Structures are given as C-alpha cells and as structure tokens.
C-alpha cells in the first residue's frame, strides 16, 4: 500500500501539528528542549515508537514554540501528549521509559474492550 510514518516529524507550528493529528489516527507528541538531557535520552526511543507502532511520532520544540505548548498545557520538559483522532487523550511527563510509552500508544491504536 501506501508508506506509512515510519520516522518522526519535526513539528513547527500549530498548523504543522494540525496537519499530523488530522492525517494520523493516533499520535505522540514529544514536547522537547535540546538542553534538556532526558529530552535527548527520548530521541532513539520515540524513534522507535515510530518505527514498531501505529502512531505518528512529532517532535516540537518547546523553546521555539512557546505558544503551541502552552496550548496543550506543557509546562515543563519532557512532556508527551497523546492525539487519537485529534483530540488530546493523555499526557505524560518527565522520562517515560519505552515499554510504558509503546503501551500507551497501543491503548489506543488497538481495540481495547
């Protein structure tokens, strides 16, 4: 079929988000500084959140994009909030490890009862 979003998108813009949680059913948001050191300990796992779920994956940085995280309510690094069919479902902050992220994602991109 069609290629799917296999890696994740750098996010400018409430535009640019709108744009991936209208198109993607499920999405993870990774609210992120570059200074931020469990911020970089995040990139390889939500890359691989992209590559193994059925999530799309958005990277924004908080520093360039003040406005859209204050709209979600990020208030700190790091924060993920979670889109299913564009709605913000979840959020979850400082350090999650991968397994608890990948189970989160797939509370929703599964059917559940």
């Given at each position: 079929g069609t290629a799917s979003p296999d890696e994740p998108l750098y996010v400018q813009g409430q535009t640019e988000l709108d744009d991936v949680t209208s198109d993607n059913d499920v999405v993870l948001a990774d609210f992120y500084a570059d200074w931020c050191g469990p911020c970089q300990m995040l990139e390889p796992v939500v890359e691989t959140l992209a590559e193994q779920t059925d999530a799309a994956v958005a990277k924004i940085d908080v520093d360039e994009n003040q406005a859209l995280a204050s709209a979600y309510g990020?208030?700190?690094?790091?924060t993920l909030v979670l889109f299913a069919d564009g709605e913000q479902v979840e959020e979850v902050v400082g350090l999650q490890d991968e397994d608890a992220l990948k189970d989160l994602i797939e509370s929703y991109t599964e059917l559940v009862p």
């Open positions: 990020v208030r700190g690094v790091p």
